[PDB]
Amino acid sequence: TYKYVNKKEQESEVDMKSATDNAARILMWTELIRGLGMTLSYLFREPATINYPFEKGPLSPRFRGEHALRRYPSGEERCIACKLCEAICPAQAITIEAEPRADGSRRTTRYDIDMTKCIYCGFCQEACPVDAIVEGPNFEFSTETHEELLYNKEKLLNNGDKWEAEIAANIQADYLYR
Amino acid sequence: MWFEILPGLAIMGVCLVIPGVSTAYIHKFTNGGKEKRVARVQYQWYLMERDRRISGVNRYYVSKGLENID
Amino acid sequence: EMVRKCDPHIGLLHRGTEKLIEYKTYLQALPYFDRLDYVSMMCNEQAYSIAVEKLLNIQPPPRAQWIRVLFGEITRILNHIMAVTTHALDIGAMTPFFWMFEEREKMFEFYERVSGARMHAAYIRPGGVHQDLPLGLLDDIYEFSKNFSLRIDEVEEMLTNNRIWRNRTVDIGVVTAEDALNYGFSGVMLRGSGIQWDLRKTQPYDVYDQVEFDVPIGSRGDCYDRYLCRVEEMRQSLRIIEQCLNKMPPGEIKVDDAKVSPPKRAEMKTSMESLIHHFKLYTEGYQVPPGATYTAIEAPKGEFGVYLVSDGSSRPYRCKIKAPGFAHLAGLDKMSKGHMLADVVAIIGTQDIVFGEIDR
Amino acid sequence: ISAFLKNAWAKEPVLVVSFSVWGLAIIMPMISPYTKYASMINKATPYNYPVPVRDDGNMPDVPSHPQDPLGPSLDWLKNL
Amino acid sequence: MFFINILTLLVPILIAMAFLTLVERKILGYMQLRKGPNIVGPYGILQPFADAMKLFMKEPMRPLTTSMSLFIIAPTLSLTLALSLWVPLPMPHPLINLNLGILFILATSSLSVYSILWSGWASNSKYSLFGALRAVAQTISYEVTMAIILLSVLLMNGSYSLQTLITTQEHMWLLLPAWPMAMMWFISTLAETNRAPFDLTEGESELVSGFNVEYAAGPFALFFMAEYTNIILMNALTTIIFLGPLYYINLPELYSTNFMMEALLLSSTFLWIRASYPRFRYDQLMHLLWKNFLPLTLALCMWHISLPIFTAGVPPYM
Amino acid sequence: ASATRVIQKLRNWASGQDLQAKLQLRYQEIAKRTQPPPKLPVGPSHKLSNNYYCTR
Amino acid sequence: MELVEVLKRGVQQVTGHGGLRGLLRVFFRANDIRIGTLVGEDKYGNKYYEDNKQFFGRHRWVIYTTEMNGKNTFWDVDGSMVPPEWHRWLHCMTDDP
Amino acid sequence: SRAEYVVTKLDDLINWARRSSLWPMTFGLACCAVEMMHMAAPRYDMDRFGVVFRASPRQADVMIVAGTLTNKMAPALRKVYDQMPEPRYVVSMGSCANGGGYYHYSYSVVRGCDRIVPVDIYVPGCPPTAEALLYGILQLQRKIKREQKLKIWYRR
Amino acid sequence: MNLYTVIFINILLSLTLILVAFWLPQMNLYSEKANPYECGFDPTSSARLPFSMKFFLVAITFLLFDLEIALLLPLPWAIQTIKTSTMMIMAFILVTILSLGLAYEWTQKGLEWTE
Ligand SMILES: CCCCCCCCCCCCCCCCCC(=O)OC[C@H](COP(=O)(O)OCCN)OC(=O)CCCCCCCCCCCCCCCCC
Ligand SMILES: CS(=O)(=O)C1CCN(c2cccc(Cn3cc(-c4nc(-c5ccc(OC(F)(F)F)cc5)no4)ccc3=O)c2)CC1
Ligand code: SF4
Ligand code: SF4
Numbered sequence A: 001t002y003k004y005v006n007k008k009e010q011e012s013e014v015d016m017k018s019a020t021d022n023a024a025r026i027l028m029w030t031e032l033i034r035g036l037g038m039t040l041s042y043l044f045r046e047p048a049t050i051n052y053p054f055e056k057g058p059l060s061p062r063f064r065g066e067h068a069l070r071r072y073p074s075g076e077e078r079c080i081a082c083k084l085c086e087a088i089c090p091a092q093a094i095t096i097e098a099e100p101r102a103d104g105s106r107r108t109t110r111y112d113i114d115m116t117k118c119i120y121c122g123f124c125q126e127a128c129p130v131d132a133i134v135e136g137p138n139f140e141f142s143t144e145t146h147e148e149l150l151y152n153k154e155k156l157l158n159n160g161d162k163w164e165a166e167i168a169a170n171i172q173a174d175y176l177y178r
Numbered sequence B: 001m002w003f004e005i006l007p008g009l010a011i012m013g014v015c016l017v018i019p020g021v022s023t024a025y026i027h028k029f030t031n032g033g034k035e036k037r038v039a040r041v042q043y044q045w046y047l048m049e050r051d052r053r054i055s056g057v058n059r060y061y062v063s064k065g066l067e068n069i070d
Numbered sequence C: 001e002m003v004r005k006c007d008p009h010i011g012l013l014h015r016g017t018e019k020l021i022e023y024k025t026y027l028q029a030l031p032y033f034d035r036l037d038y039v040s041m042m043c044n045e046q047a048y049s050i051a052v053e054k055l056l057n058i059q060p061p062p063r064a065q066w067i068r069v070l071f072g073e074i075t076r077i078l079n080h081i082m083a084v085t086t087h088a089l090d091i092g093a094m095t096p097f098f099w100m101f102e103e104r105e106k107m108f109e110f111y112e113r114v115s116g117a118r119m120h121a122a123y124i125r126p127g128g129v130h131q132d133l134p135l136g137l138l139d140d141i142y143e144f145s146k147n148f149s150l151r152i153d154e155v156e157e158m159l160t161n162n163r164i165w166r167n168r169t170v171d172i173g174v175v176t177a178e179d180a181l182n183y184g185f186s187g188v189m190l191r192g193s194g195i196q197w198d199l200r201k202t203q204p205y206d207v208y209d210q211v212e213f214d215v216p217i218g219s220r221g222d223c224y225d226r227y228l229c230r231v232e233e234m235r236q237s238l239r240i241i242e243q244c245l246n247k248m249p250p251g252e253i254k255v256d257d258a259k260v261s262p263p264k265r266a267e268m269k270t271s272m273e274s275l276i277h278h279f280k281l282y283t284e285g286y287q288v289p290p291g292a293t294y295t296a297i298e299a300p301k302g303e304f305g306v307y308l309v310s311d312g313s314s315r316p317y318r319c320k321i322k323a324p325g326f327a328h329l330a331g332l333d334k335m336s337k338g339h340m341l342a343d344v345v346a347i348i349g350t351q352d353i354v355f356g357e358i359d360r
Numbered sequence D: 001i002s003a004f005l006k007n008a009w010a011k012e013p014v015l016v017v018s019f020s021v022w023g024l025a026i027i028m029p030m031i032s033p034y035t036k037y038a039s040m041i042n043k044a045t046p047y048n049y050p051v052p053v054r055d056d057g058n059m060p061d062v063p064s065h066p067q068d069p070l071g072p073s074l075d076w077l078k079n080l
Numbered sequence E: 001m002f003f004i005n006i007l008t009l010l011v012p013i014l015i016a017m018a019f020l021t022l023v024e025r026k027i028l029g030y031m032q033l034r035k036g037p038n039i040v041g042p043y044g045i046l047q048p049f050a051d052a053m054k055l056f057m058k059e060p061m062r063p064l065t066t067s068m069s070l071f072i073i074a075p076t077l078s079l080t081l082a083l084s085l086w087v088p089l090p091m092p093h094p095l096i097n098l099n100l101g102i103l104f105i106l107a108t109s110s111l112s113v114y115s116i117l118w119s120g121w122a123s124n125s126k127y128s129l130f131g132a133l134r135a136v137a138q139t140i141s142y143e144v145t146m147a148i149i150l151l152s153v154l155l156m157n158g159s160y161s162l163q164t165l166i167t168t169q170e171h172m173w174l175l176l177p178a179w180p181m182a183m184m185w186f187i188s189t190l191a192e193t194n195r196a197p198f199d200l201t202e203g204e205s206e207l208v209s210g211f212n213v214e215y216a217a218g219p220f221a222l223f224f225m226a227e228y229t230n231i232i233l234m235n236a237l238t239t240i241i242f243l244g245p246l247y248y249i250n251l252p253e254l255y256s257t258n259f260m261m262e263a264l265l266l267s268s269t270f271l272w273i274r275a276s277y278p279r280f281r282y283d284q285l286m287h288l289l290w291k292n293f294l295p296l297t298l299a300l301c302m303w304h305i306s307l308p309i310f311t312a313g314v315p316p317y318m
Numbered sequence F: 001a002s003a004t005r006v007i008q009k010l011r012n013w014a015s016g017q018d019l020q021a022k023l024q025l026r027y028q029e030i031a032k033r034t035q036p037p038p039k040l041p042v043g044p045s046h047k048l049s050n051n052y053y054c055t056r
Numbered sequence G: 001m002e003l004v005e006v007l008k009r010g011v012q013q014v015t016g017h018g019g020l021r022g023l024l025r026v027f028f029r030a031n032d033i034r035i036g037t038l039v040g041e042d043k044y045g046n047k048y049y050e051d052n053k054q055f056f057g058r059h060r061w062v063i064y065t066t067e068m069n070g071k072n073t074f075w076d077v078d079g080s081m082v083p084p085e086w087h088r089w090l091h092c093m094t095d096d097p
Numbered sequence H: 001s002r003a004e005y006v007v008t009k010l011d012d013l014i015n016w017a018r019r020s021s022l023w024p025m026t027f028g029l030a031c032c033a034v035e036m037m038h039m040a041a042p043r044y045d046m047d048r049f050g051v052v053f054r055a056s057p058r059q060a061d062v063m064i065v066a067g068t069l070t071n072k073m074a075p076a077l078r079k080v081y082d083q084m085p086e087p088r089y090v091v092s093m094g095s096c097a098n099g100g101g102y103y104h105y106s107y108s109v110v111r112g113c114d115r116i117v118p119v120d121i122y123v124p125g126c127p128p129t130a131e132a133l134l135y136g137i138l139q140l141q142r143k144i145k146r147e148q149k150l151k152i153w154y155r156r
Numbered sequence I: 001m002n003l004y005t006v007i008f009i010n011i012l013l014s015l016t017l018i019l020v021a022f023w024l025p026q027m028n029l030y031s032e033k034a035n036p037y038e039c040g041f042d043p044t045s046s047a048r049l050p051f052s053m054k055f056f057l058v059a060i061t062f063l064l065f066d067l068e069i070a071l072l073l074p075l076p077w078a079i080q081t082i083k084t085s086t087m088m089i090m091a092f093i094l095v096t097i098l099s100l101g102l103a104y105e106w107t108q109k110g111l112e113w114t115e
């Protein structure tokens, strides 16, 4: 179906009352007074402004911000160098080099992420079959230097050791929806 | 809320009141507790020069009454 | 200040998307369609997904389709907000921007809840959506939709019956229907001129044809009739969201074919076939049978289409994006004839121009 | 013609008002009984000195003193 | 003593310009559902000083294409005149009693346009020239109606002096007999200041900044403060002419108080209007002032020429 | 809601609408941030009989 | 009437922050003085408050401490001074402190 | 009354001004401009901090590179920056501006705005949450808090 | 003398501001900064070329209307005259002829801009 927005106008019938009403509208600026009234109403409303950085904007567990490599509760690393994360990373931001750890386990030596290439898409944490790489909630990690934004294994491991209390709970919340 | 605006309005109101009160009080202080005489036409200026002259000191606002005619 | 020629020099935001895509897989290429038109994201994801599904010969499930329509209309509202308010700003009115971006933020919250991102949610995917709705989201969408009409009314009160807005958007940027068809316009740039055309009623692409709504049509092909068309399309998007909320079916969200849509985590971690399929979909991808489509949808800007050529591989051989705004901007020199600078600003605005899709 | 005046009062009331006020400005002076008083007032003002005349002894209509009841009175202006 | 009076008239006007920028921002914010400056100081009473200090600490620009002489003179003149228009104002007693004060106002205002003209021409940039020509059009549009409105009002005051309006309104505002003229004068003062909906001289949506586009921190600050001072000036003019504060010779302080209240109201109305409306096209401004305001203005000038005659209400010459 | 029966009247008259019933702010009329756990369903191709991928 | 109650609320706000010294502390390092319940205090000194009668974005907030790992944070505060325990809460990802 | 103490306080004042009044420039290239807007919106009121978008570079103090920087646009960006008057700061917003991002390996993208202009602060994200861009603005505020220019002049 | 005093005080205030704006701050001048601004790219020409004017007729008319205003301004004094009928008639004739000229211009499309 369809409707008209500016064809409503029908044949012209005009009286003295209609003419006088249009004249008052044209001479006393009726329609503009109404915009003035709207802006006035907004002045006496509560502003939606939050007091950052004290009170902050809402978020959800699914928020995908800063990356971190997690561990099993034993302290062992979850990554096994399967390389799905870098195989799908559509920005080619991940870089991995694996090697048999002295104990024989399959682990990484290099795990680098150019956070100037990451598009923060989440494909790596939905590809990881061991829930090792995640995209944490932290977004307040700006820097004064480009180099600081080229994370390696130690940086991501430290982030994981810093946010686990939050990452784990957000996972526990969201992992049934996946 | 909207009442967070009254500080600036009050400041600017004080600042806009100051000029007139200042001008009035200064005119009174400088013209002998009187409003500064207005000279819109030459007659008023003539009157003021007359007053200036008759006043012992050349100042138009030193009014000389009946104490100075005998 | 009278304009005698407009020579738009696009390309300051060309990035080589259509080539990188050739160098990517399909999933690995999906986010480009979010990054193309960055105010109507879900619609681009939807077009891409529909094309890939056509080439795969699969059907997304009902719930996923209803969610796609829900968020498509939410994006229509987002984009019409942005269009109208930037139009006004570039014309002088500044408050509607601030009034409606507070609502844009709530809809970004919807995005973030369902995807994790406020703006570029790679949520719509070939086969459906990545992840089901979280409990308590439809209620919030209802609480937002039951009030949005009031904000549309406030804006209209500021603009519609205002003689200044009219003097700026009336008899301005006029387009005849035949010239529009020829120049290749689509959407509001076509309806404001009086053409009955909508790819949601003609050539429907989802549960559209199960949801009732009216198409707003203009008579004078001017910036005013297009602005009205956009407002009324927002209202009709509310009408559609009401139905999508009340009738949303139970079921799964992504095709139950684990050679296209990856399997759930709990099944990957206990089933061998599902683990294999996950591994392969996330490293290699899914092979798409050869062929070529041109799928188009009614994006809030107009007809957004993708011509997708496939070999028997996991990567596209060619993927061109047909952007509504290319031809709309090509028509600027014509629509600007006999007008001034400020009128040219108004005309740039009434086309709802975004350059991520024009230059891409 | 009434329909023309009406559609103008609806469409272009500014010119209607302009012509109406033009006509009223041109007419009302011909109408009012307080029009004669403008010149009488502007004449009553003593912007100059009322130079006196020499008493030739043949000016009965002329006064010898301001408060002598002779000459133009301003009562019509004291209660107007 | 006179220099102290100069100070008591000048420094408060500049402080009021600063806090007017403040009130502008905060009012527009609350209308736009936001707060406005509250961080820099208590509720933001230091943002203007921050802005000004920061500007007068920045590198100014001496471009290669500019006529530096006019480029530097124009802001000087703008500020000078913005501050000089405040001297003949009775609040209720002026610093300089002029018989032809209205004409002083008119001439100084019509002169403040040459700051914009010469700035935009000197800058030697296309957007600057566009702003200058738009100012030309704006003046050509409003200056005709300004003087006729003002004459029609003064034909019941009896003179061009600003201090006889006080005795004229001693009993009743001049808004009742002249509210049409008051409306037209309000919009024309809205235009005289290049203020929304007539912010065409610096229209950011068509001309990045207009005549300011090449100007930098210090001179730009001069231009800006001149604008926000002329705003208050024209509000004071409206509220001395058409609105009448209470004048009791033993109580001029009440006069200043009510004058200030009304001026604040009119300025807040200017800000309200900036927030509420889109921007004109500079041909439509001409069409307005020459097709709706000038005919009516002439009709009302004739009406107010006749009214003192068929009413015997001719005003006095002092 | 913090308004006080007078500002409300004023702004409802100025706007011409009953705003207090439709607010731009969210006061506890929203779903919580801590929901219970879900139990998602499964699609049709989760059977153990007459499910051969050569058919579907 | 109504003005009396709003003024009493304002007086509670002014007086309900320690004394004058604490009132000024909060007003000048947080730019807001509204009062709310206390939920907890982390080992770093950051206090977390709650007032559900305010609207969504404003019903939870923080008062960053003055010292955190040797940095004088009386004036120079940032959102990165919030540990994760309270991040998930403050950002309304959980209803559970 | 040591001149060094006086100079430290004067520099505190200088930085306070240049910091509490940061007028950026209306320079938005791609998606990230939307989050810039949203940071101008009620929830995050910029002017609340003293931030004001001026459209002329000759009046601006900082420029936020809010999106992808192509080779056809880099000359204009460098020109605008050059035309901004010292003191002038720069903020890279997003992953496109920092290192090209999702288009790093393209033939028409500069792999970082830091190649064309010098950058003070990098805001990561695609797009960065407006809250994050605000965090970056305040990080810049603090960096300005730590300029210590007049102390250097006095030590010379 | 006092008017001279005030106006010169304002001159000096403005000039002091400009001096301390041009000599206080640190500068770093170079051509790419001091060059004209044309939205990021280089000007294709000079801004000192003919910028056609489409309201030239309206400006010419504005001159004559300014003169008519100059002739209307002495009314506050002309109303203090004994010959009131003459002043009334002359003012009415003046304003009417002004309006008639404006109407002729309007009709002949002078107030409309060349396109
Ligand atoms: C016996 C009686 C004898 C006396 C004779 C007089 C009799 C009374 C006559 C009354 C006449 C009404 C007053 C005249 C003023 C209004 C003039 C006018 O109507 O102009 C209308 C003009 C055109 O409007 P438009 O809709 O485009 O129509 C175009 C024509 N087809 O559009 C406009 O001009 C208005 C648009 C301006 C927009 C700018 C923003 C306006 C802001 C509004 C603020 C209002 C606050 C007023 C404050 C005043 C306090 C001083
Ligand atoms: C989207 S919006 O609708 O929100 C939009 C509305 C408009 N808006 C706005 C309004 C007012 C001012 C500004 C900041 N601003 C300030 C100056 C400038 N100010 C002074 C100055 C000199 C002396 C002063 O006094 C003393 F220092 F004491 F002498 C005080 C000040 N010089 O330059 C120049 C340019 C500028 O943008 C911004 C916010 C945004
Ligand atoms: S979120 Fe996406 S772009 Fe970022 S590292 Fe993971 S896979 Fe790569
Ligand atoms: S997907 Fe997970 S386990 Fe595999 S390489 Fe990446 S981080 Fe390691």
Ligand code: SF4
Binding pocket: A119, C035, C038, C120, H030, H031, H032, H066, H067, H068, H093, H094, H095, H096, H097, H101, H102, H125, H126, H127, H128
């Ligand atoms: S970083 Fe992401 S959001 Fe920002 S401009 Fe690039 S693609 Fe768009």
